[PDB]
Amino acid sequence: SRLNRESVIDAALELLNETGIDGLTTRKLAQKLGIEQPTLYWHVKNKRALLDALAVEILARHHDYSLPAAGESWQSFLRNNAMSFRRALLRYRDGAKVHLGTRPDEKQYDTVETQLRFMTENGFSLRDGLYAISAVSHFTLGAVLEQQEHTAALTDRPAAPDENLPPLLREALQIMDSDDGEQAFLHGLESLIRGFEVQLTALLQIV
Amino acid sequence: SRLNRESVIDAALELLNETGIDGLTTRKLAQKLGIEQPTLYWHVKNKRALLDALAVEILARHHDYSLPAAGESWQSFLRNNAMSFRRALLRYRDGAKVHLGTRPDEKQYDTVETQLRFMTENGFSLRDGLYAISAVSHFTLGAVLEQQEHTAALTDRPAAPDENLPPLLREALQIMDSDDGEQAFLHGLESLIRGFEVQLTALLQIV
Numbered sequence: 519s520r521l522n523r524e525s526v527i528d529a530a531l532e533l534l535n536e537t538g539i540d541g542l543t544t545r546k547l548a549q550k551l552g553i554e555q556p557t558l559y560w561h562v563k564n565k566r567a568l569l570d571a572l573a574v575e576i577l578a579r580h581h582d583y584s585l586p587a588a589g590e591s592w593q594s595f596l597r598n599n600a601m602s603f604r605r606a607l608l609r610y611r612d613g614a615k616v617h618l619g620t621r622p623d624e625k626q627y628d629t630v631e632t633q634l635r636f637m638t639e640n641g642f643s644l645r646d647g648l649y650a651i652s653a654v655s656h657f658t659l660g661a662v663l664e665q666q667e668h669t670a671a672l673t674d675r676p677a678a679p680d681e682n683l684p685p686l687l688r689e690a691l692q693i694m695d696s697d698d699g700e701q702a703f704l705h706g707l708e709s710l711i712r713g714f715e716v717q718l719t720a721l722l723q724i725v
Numbered sequence: 726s727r728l729n730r731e732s733v734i735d736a737a738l739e740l741l742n743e744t745g746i747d748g749l750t751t752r753k754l755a756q757k758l759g760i761e762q763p764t765l766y767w768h769v770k771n772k773r774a775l776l777d778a779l780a781v782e783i784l785a786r787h788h789d790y791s792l793p794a795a796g797e798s799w800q801s802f803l804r805n806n807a808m809s810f811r812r813a814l815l816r817y818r819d820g821a822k823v824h825l826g827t828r829p830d831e832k833q834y835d836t837v838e839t840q841l842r843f844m845t846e847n848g849f850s851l852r853d854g855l856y857a858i859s860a861v862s863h864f865t866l867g868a869v870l871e872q873q874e875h876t877a878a879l880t881d882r883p884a885a886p887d888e889n890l891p892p893l894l895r896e897a898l899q900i901m902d903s904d905d906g907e908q909a910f911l912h913g914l915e916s917l918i919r920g921f922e923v924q925l926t927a928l929l930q931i932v
């Protein structure tokens with residue numbers, strides 16, 4: 519196989535879809551690529567370095583809404599950015615777990631600087647803007663992680679007795695399982711944005 | 726060692742603090758307890774069953790604010806409940822990762838039924854109430870997971886060059902690292918609650 523960076527990342531992503539993050543080993547990546555391990559080591563020093571790389575590439579390839587359009591409202595940008603982030607995390611098995619614990623890579627520096635600058639231009643202090651942005655990121659990841667781990671653990675876990683369930687919980691579980699979490703996610707996103715908006719527009723009023 | 730359920734859970738929790746969730750094996754739990762594996766197997770069939778159990782016990786022991794006080798506002802309850810959930814998740818190394826993908830256990834059924842009933846009593850439809858509650862849970866877990874995995878991965882990961890950082894990102898990173906994520910978390914929580922409140926009070930107005 520070719521072993522440029524781009525090839526290795528392709529094979530690692532496919533492998534991730536087949537095995538999830540705990541099955542994503544250096545030994546299995548070597549087998550997928552048709553090489554011995556010492557050969558892989560020249561290219562990929564360890565699991566951490568691979569995962570860091572994957573975290574960036576997943577967004578570089580599938581996170582299309584990383585920047586505000588010309589004249590777009592801050593509220594609209596957060597909306598579009600959260601939905602793009604969610605789609606990119608959901609594209610790969612354990613995608614959100616691959617993101618977790620990263621911080622912006624050099625390759626994302628200008629992107630992430632512009633996001634923060636754009637909030638300050640719309641009235642936010644840096645710290646308030648950052649808190650808004652972070653809250654969107656946290657909420658989005660928590661929702662995707664719950665969905666994805668729920669899915670992967672509902673194989674190991676046997677049944678769920680619809681018999682001794684109390685009535686609202688029974689109904690809540692039907693609701694929750696009726697889609698991919700998308701509606702719950704979108705409803706929450708709107709709440710979060712409006713909340714911010716109240717905060718910003720208050721200024722020094724007690725609110 | 727004694728091998729009642731409570732003992733096994735104690736030793737598993739200590740082990741979790743020492744090794745994190747990926748180091749929490751059946752073989753190491755046997756060593757900690759001074760027994761052979763076949764002995765442990767009689768008591769604990771697999772890693773999944775152990776983790777499910779841990780997820781419940783962590784909350785049973787440290788999540789004190791699971792129910793509304795007498796006459797407490799819905800907004801106040803969500804606030805107190807989110808802060809209690811966060812504290813309980815943060816008490817153990819990888820605690821939030823141990824929660825992830827679970828769903829309410831029989832032992833929590835009445836607790837979780839009362840939470841949902843209490844929201845419907847305050848004006849929420851069941852589905853709106855559930856969405857609010859879920860958004861709090863998701864946001865809380867995302868914040869705790871980012872904190873905790875950031876911490877555990879900032880050992881494997883070498884430095885972060887304060888040199889070529891753009892100015893707002895440099896400052897945002899100083900801000901973020903200034904505490905445990907608590908302030909960012911609390912600020913976001915308030916936004917989320919106010920958002921809900923706008924939604925509820927709108928009824929059928931366009932809002």
Ligand SMILES: CN(C)[C@@H]1C(O)=C(C(N)=O)C(=O)[C@@]2(O)C(O)=C3C(=O)c4c(O)ccc(Cl)c4[C@@](C)(O)[C@H]3C[C@@H]12
Pocket residue numbers: 577581583584599600603620621622626629630651652654655894897898901
């Ligand atoms: C999902 N969205 C809000 C953000 C986004 O669109 C990103 C992107 N590359 O386009 C991010 O890197 C983000 O998805 C992302 O991952 C960010 C993030 O990790 C982060 C951390 O950990 C620490 C400090 C900062 Cl300043 C950031 C931060 C704010 O830049 C966020 C940005 C989000």
Ligand SMILES: CN(C)[C@@H]1C(O)=C(C(N)=O)C(=O)[C@@]2(O)C(O)=C3C(=O)c4c(O)ccc(Cl)c4[C@@](C)(O)[C@H]3C[C@@H]12
Pocket residue numbers: 687690691694784788790791806807810827828829833836837858859861862
């Ligand atoms: C953090 N807090 C909001 C909740 C809470 O206090 C719980 C608790 N046992 O006291 C939960 O189990 C929760 O922390 C928790 O874990 C819940 C949760 O997993 C969940 C899932 O997965 C599916 C359906 C339902 Cl109806 C629930 C659910 C709403 O009951 C939540 C409740 C939250």
Ligand SMILES: [Cl-]
Pocket residue numbers: 519520
């Ligand atoms: Cl080739």
Ligand SMILES: [Cl-]
Pocket residue numbers: 519520521522
């Ligand atoms: Cl090559």
Ligand SMILES: [Cl-]
Pocket residue numbers: none
């Ligand atoms: Cl500029």
Ligand SMILES: [Cl-]
Pocket residue numbers: 726727
């Ligand atoms: Cl003993």
Ligand SMILES: [Cl-]
Pocket residue numbers: 726727728729
């Ligand atoms: Cl015993």
Ligand SMILES: [Cl-]
Pocket residue numbers: none
């Ligand atoms: Cl009742």
Ligand code: NI
Pocket residue numbers: 617620621622655
């Ligand atoms: Ni991130």
Ligand code: NI
Pocket residue numbers: 824827828829862
């Ligand atoms: Ni849960």
